[PDB]
Design a protein around this nucleic acid. Sequence first.
RNA 1: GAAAUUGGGCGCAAUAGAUAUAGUACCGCAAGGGAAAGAUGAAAAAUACCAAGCAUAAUAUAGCAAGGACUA
Length: 45
Amino acid sequence: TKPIPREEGPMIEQLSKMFFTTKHRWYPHGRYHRCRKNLNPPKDR
RNA sequence: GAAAUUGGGCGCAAUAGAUAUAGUACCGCAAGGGAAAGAUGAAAAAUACCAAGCAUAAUAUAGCAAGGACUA
Ligand SMILES: [Mg+2]
Ligand SMILES: [Mg+2]
Ligand SMILES: [Mg+2]
């Protein structure tokens, strides 16, 4: 063990590069898709 | 295909029922063809919720548009 040590375009590129994903999931989506979403989904465990 | 002979409504109710509110409007030189549509209430001397289409609310990679799903 080691001891404990003590704008839309550029913002979407910055998030892509930060979280190692592509750009597409940072663009929004329309109302038809925002309102189909279940905001009170079933929980378990 | 003979003859003798024998002896009111388990209706329609405005695309229905009349073409019919009218043989008018309209069309045709003419004969002739030929429509559509209305809905308050006792009194007008009392002025809701439902088709398609839209709007509230445009859109986000991929595709008979869904289905299996899924925390989404
Ligand atoms: Mg008639
Ligand atoms: Mg509708
Ligand atoms: Mg696919």
